[PDB]
Write a protein that binds this DNA or RNA. Sequence first.
RNA 1: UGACGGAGCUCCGUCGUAACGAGGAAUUCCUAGUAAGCGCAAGUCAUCAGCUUGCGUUGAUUACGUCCCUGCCCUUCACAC
Lengths: 102, 38, 206, 51, 125, 62, 219, 102, 63, 11, 229
Amino acid sequence: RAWDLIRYRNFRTFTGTERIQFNCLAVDPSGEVVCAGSLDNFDIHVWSVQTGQLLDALSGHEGPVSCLSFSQENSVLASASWDKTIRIWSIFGRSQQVEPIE
Amino acid sequence: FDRTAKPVPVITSEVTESLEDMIRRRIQDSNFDDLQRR
Amino acid sequence: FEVVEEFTPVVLATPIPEEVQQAQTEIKLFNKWSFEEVEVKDASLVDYVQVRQPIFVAHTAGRYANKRFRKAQCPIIERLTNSLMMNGRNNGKKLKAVRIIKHTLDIINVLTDQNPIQVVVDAITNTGPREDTTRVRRQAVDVSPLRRVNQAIALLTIGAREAAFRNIKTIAETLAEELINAAKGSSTSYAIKKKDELERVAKSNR
Amino acid sequence: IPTHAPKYEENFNPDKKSYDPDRTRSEINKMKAQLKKERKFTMKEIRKDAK
Amino acid sequence: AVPSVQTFGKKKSATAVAHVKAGKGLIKVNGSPITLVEPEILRFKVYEPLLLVGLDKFSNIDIRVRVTGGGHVSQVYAIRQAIAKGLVAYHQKYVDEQSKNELKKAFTSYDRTLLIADSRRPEPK
Amino acid sequence: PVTLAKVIKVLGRTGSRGGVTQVRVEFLEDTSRTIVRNVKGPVRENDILVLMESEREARRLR
Amino acid sequence: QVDDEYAATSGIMDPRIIVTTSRDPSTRLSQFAKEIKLLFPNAVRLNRGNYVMPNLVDACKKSGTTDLVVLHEHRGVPTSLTISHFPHGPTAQFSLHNVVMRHDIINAGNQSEVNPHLIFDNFTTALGKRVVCILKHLFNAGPKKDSERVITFANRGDFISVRQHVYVRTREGVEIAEVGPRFEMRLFELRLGTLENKDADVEWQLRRFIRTANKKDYL
Amino acid sequence: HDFAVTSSTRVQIFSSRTRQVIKTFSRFKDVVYSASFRSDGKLLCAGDATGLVSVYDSYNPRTILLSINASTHPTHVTKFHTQDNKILATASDDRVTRLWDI
Amino acid sequence: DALMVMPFSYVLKFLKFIDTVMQNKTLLHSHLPLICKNLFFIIKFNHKELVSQKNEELKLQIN
Amino acid sequence: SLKAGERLMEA
Amino acid sequence: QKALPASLVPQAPPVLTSKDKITKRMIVVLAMASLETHKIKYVLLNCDDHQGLLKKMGRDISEARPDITHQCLLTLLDSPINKAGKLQVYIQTSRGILIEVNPTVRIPRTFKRFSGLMVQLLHKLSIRSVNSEEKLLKVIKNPITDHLPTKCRKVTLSFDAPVIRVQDYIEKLDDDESICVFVGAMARGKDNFADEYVDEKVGLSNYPLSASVACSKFCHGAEDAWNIL
RNA sequence: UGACGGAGCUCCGUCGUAACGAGGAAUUCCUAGUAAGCGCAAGUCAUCAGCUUGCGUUGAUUACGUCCCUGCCCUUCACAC
């Protein structure tokens, strides 16, 4: 759920297709991409704040994503799981690349 | 002497003619066995 | 003033050759060349001619194709070894490449008393084409530093190889000659000739 | 510089066979080729007929 | 009971089992001295851990390494992973932790593969 | 004499010829003077490039 | 109704397909591997160099891939095709006959990559309905009504003929043009599991050595 | 201090203690005219009736480091410069004593 | 993106252009928001070069 | 054809 | 009192081939050679002998003269510079086929016999000697750049270009270098065939020059410049 | 960037540098344990031995940007814009 403090309204709500519980969240520095994680899905959901559609479900973790964060400068995404690994996602750009680290 | 399995078919001209006729019939009726969003 | 971290002599039940202890004092390529005095003379090749991390042997099994610019962090000697092996018959044979390179540094040190690693660095820096051409006719265009180092290694390896393809001179000696000449800047090195021709052609299409 | 002359066949036909020094060597080569063509021709025919 | 620890190092199919106990500094690979491991050109690679921490630490332990599977390169990688992991585990169990800390620091500062298995798991694109 | 210029911005949307990147560089000698150039190899920011000529201004190379 | 394996995603998510070949494929097999992806809109070709099947399936499963396709050959002649549906099957094994590739056509030109129209003809038995279910879901849904590109799966005595045409609706009928490739597929093994699982239970298998195998029909 | 003797078309290096041949250089096609070492003793230079001067690594007969065709006349004397390692002196029947550099 | 491609030399012509627009106050109020956005980014993008110059005529234009 | 910016430079 | 060479016996100069790149050389490039074969038996298409056949092919018979290519090789091959082992010739067919001409070859002086070689060479891709010891004509891989010397100077024969003296030109060039001359075997056409790869174009005489005349004129200067005699 | 023999890819020792000598024009494919080299198994109701499928070992260069060319496809619930 997305909130504007100026008018204190829930200006948008994002929901997964599969009715997934979400535990961790991160917002792009540009404030255009909102990305959340779950303990039940093993994948990472992404939405557009402007339209609210689900852009893509980022996959590759064999365990639940525990927590999430974007770069304030580089705009890259860092994800972690109980899969004993860290994956760096370059979602922005023409090509998508993932860098896993154990 | 007998033969054991099916003989492999030969794609002859009349078979090609018969097949494409069915294709032309299906499209003329727009009868397509297609997958659609539910 | 003095600090003592070792209050007993060290004798290991398994014998160790003493040069290994001398290596423990300092990490040296093949336990025979020091990286401390090696510097890239040209500023541009810095941050892409990586020599600050010392290594005993060129082999590392690093992950150097994963990202775009990872190849920069590779030791340059390992890059030369990887470029040396080529042409199908030598494909898959990195150990032969390491042996050939070790012979090449031996030859270089013999011919010139200067540290061979600095000779390698000088050759690579000298042979880096600073400007090139692109097809439109041709138009002159600048050259990125990684393209410089990659293309430099390519010319050095290719020239040394082709020079010894059907000649008595072996791969190690033709390498040592080509790197020595490139470090000198003499036109004798094939790579320097190609660099000069490329930059001149771009000058014509400037 | 040393001087040498080219070797070539006047009236050359690439589709035509290369000329052979030994006639018996050529003649058997002809008929080995003929046998193979006839054999492969027969084998496809018997298969299709049997099919 | 003699203080001892057991560790494993894996590279491709090559697997090395390193047993590290209190001792007088005997390092053996497959029942032979570490100086006799082959290929010769890559020997320093298996010497690689031994050199960083200094031979003094090893004067007080014996180590036995058994290698099976894979090729020569993979076997050497297994040996070096196993020796590093065995040293760290032995100093963990039987020595102060400042030890385990600087050993881990030096090994990871040089090359992390001494401690962490390097698996080129397929990645789709 | 050949000058050195550190890239500060890789220009986008420039439609240069394939394999060619239009870029903005700043001369090391003068941190004020900037020039736009065309580069052949892959490039990131914070690199430095050796310029034979310092006067030519980049043009979109078709 | 659509089967349990596909019912979860039938009409909800588009399929993700990977096409591969046997180890050390010949050029023609790779060329055929190049055609098959172009048949399926969401297919991606992957080189099978030194890949191990449990690694292959596991890596593809991590990718979220929906289906995996592997091709075999004999002296540059495609011979078999297998389709395995993730995450737990089924896996179908097909045998290729009378294969004619588009590279055998001179000046053929480039194809269209629009979401195709699909034709399944003469599939009657429950097994026939099954085979349609696997084959149907490889493609994307909701093809545009005027989409010009059509694929047909025609059953003729268990010998499924596949043709792929581009049509133009004329004022007095419809005209179609073949684009290729041509080949004949016959299912001969269907198992409840991924292709890695040689131990998967068999839903059905083709008995060639039954006496009536000369004449018995299945699809 | 192993000592080198030039005999016929070969050069034999004898160990001081063993007083026996420890190295043999027989690559020379014609008669060999010199076996002088460098100051460091690492390299050995020699002359031939063909006039070519070949530089070998001392105690490594297999490897040839440098070969120079000083003249088509016989080369009888080949001596390293004692002060400077890099420069090698070559004297021939050509009556010109060329000073080479490695 | 179009304006970032502009070399600094064309910025000075741009500043001179904006100055000339100022006298035509009819054009000024017609497209005031656009003049603000384009002028002011330009100062942002190449601020370092702009401040560097000592040119008196540029100093009066900016004022 | 000429693009944004390039057209401006002419203008 | 500089001493004599020990061996004063005449020694044949080496045959210079593509594998050797260091040696100073003159390379004459006969660009746009009109050499094509067609079954009637394959015959080298000619401007005069096959007019109707070329019209069926759709190619103009003006640019269907292998005689010019034949004559240039004769004067080039017969030049003393070739006898001194300092010249190698490459031929670029208009279709895009590159031919390496071994300096040792002796092409037939009659054109009809020369045409018999070209169909043999174009189809068999190689020509062997009478004693079967060396390949004289061998088709090679484009581009022409790789086969040429590592350090070389490039020029074309352009009527529009300024007139230069070939002797003064070769003299002012360096020694380790080599000179490559692109000669257009065409009867007529634009001089842009080699423009991609050459650095400059030069004129040899103010009057128009035939390909056979121009290449002969250019090489004579090298002999005077290099003292080939 | 050879052949022969021995020893454990490495080391040691010996030698020695009719047709064809690494393959034209064109055209195809290819991005990491990938290209390529090497060997060892099995023949799994279709196919395969003129071979097919597996298994391990060694293991790179260059790109991972660009829509400039060439094709295909899509568009015409706040804040800020």
